[PDB]
């Protein structure tokens, strides 16, 4: 509290650098973090950049106090329906401070294995920011913290964004996010599949990335898709299904998922229909970086 | 006969679809004719994975008059492509 600019701007750096050395005051790093928090709403906009960056760089902090930054909600209302420093920092004047905030959040989320689940909603909600840079940074941070995270109901919202005008960067970033996310519910996989199909049929230019994201989405968790095998590919029990076109880039898209999932689960070539075997041979011959070698009798 | 004139075709996907649409016909002689024709079109479609696959499929069957044509088409591609020859 020096009540003049250009002073606090570096006093914050000093408090951070001294604090990070050793946490022993009475709580020292927690106290310094609290001070930075109470400062994050500085009058200027130049200070807040350092404020955000430095607290982001910091890594060790008291858990219980950490969530008190995010504690205020319509988000918990939605969660029930299905069943403060950052709270203000995320929505600020100009996008520079938003970028700094998201970077700090990703850094300390990586640091702490917990506290991630608390921040997924705060990330996802902040997609329609209108600043493409913030868009991209939000997608990147979600990717970077995507581990041991669940989207029991967040799937639909984070996938709705997949339909952008061209936003080639945004849509590619969403595919990158999906290939590294985690889902737990079968209906979630089904939903993601259907929105991806809509994406492909509306923007027939990034199928080359749709296929890879589906490949990873299969390999990541195979068992989830096994119940879908009868339904996703038409296998009418006592009717011989007409060969679907071999080269259609929706049928190929849904086949690559199955084949990638099939490396793990041994039982499922039983579910595979008549065509799928020769079609698998054709795929494994065409796109050798999407479908791994399998145990199928046709290609021993 | 007119192989030199093949390269100067502006529209290739339509033509190849028409020619390839008769490889699924059950007739063992109609498959042999089409495999010969594909073999005669390696110059203008040397990287087509679907054609490569169909030839590699017909190469291991029970109908002599089509195996003796799949052999020809395979020898034809194996000159104008690499990823086909490796398989």
């Amino acid at each position: 509290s020096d009540d003049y600019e250009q002073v606090r701007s570096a006093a914050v750096q000093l408090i951070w650098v001294v604090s990070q050395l050793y946490p022993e005051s009475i709580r020292l790093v927690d106290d310094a973090f609290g001070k930075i928090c109470h400062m994050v709403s500085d009058g200027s906009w130049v200070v807040r950049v350092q404020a955000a960056k430095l607290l982001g760089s910091m890594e060790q902090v008291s858990s219980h106090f950490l969530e008190q930054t995010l504690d205020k909600t319509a988000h918990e209302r939605a969660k029930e329906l299905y069943s403060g420093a950052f709270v203000h920092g995320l929505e600020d004047e100009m996008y520079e401070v938003r970028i700094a905030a998201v970077e700090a959040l990703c850094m300390l989320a990586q640091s702490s294995p917990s506290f991630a689940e608390k921040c997924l909603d705060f990330l996802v909600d902040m997609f329609n920011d209108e600043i493409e840079e913030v868009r991209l940074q939000s997608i990147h941070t979600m990717r970077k913290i995507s581990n041991n995270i669940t989207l029991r109901e967040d799937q639909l919202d984070t996938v709705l964004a997949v339909l952008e005008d061209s936003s080639r960067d945004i849509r590619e970033a969403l595919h990158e996010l999906l290939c590294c996310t985690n889902v737990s519910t079968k209906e979630g996989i089904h939903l993601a599949l259907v929105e991806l199909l809509k994406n492909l049929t509306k923007y027939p230019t990034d199928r080359d990335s749709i296929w890879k994201c589906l490949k990873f989405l299969g390999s990541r968790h195979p068992t989830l898709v096994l119940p879908l095998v009868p339904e996703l590919l038409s296998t009418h029990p006592f009717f011989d299904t007409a060969e679907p076109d071999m080269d259609d880039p929706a049928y190929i898209a849904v086949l690559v998922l199955i084949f990638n999932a099939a490396k793990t689960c041994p039982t499922m070539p039983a579910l595979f229909s008549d065509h799928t075997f020769r079609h698998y041979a054709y795929l494994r011959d065409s796109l050798s970086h999407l479908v791994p070698a399998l145990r199928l009798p046709g290609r021993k | 006969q007119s192989e030199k004139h093949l390269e100067k075709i502006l529209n290739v996907d339509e033509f190849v679809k028409r020619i390839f649409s008769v490889i699924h016909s059950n007739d063992p002689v109609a498959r042999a004719i089409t495999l010969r024709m594909l073999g005669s079109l390696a110059s203008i479609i040397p990287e087509r994975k679907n054609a490569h696959h169909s030839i590699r499929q017909s190469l291991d069957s029970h109908d002599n008059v089509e195996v003796e044509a799949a052999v020809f088409a395979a020898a034809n591609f194996s000159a104008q492509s690499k990823d086909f020859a490796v398989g």
Binding site: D240, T241, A242, E243, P244, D245, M246 | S21, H24, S25, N26, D27, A30
Partner: peptide, 14 residues
Amino acid sequence: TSPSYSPTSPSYSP
């Protein structure tokens, strides 16, 4: 219908 094209076969679109 189509005596040589087989009942279970990809249909020619055009």
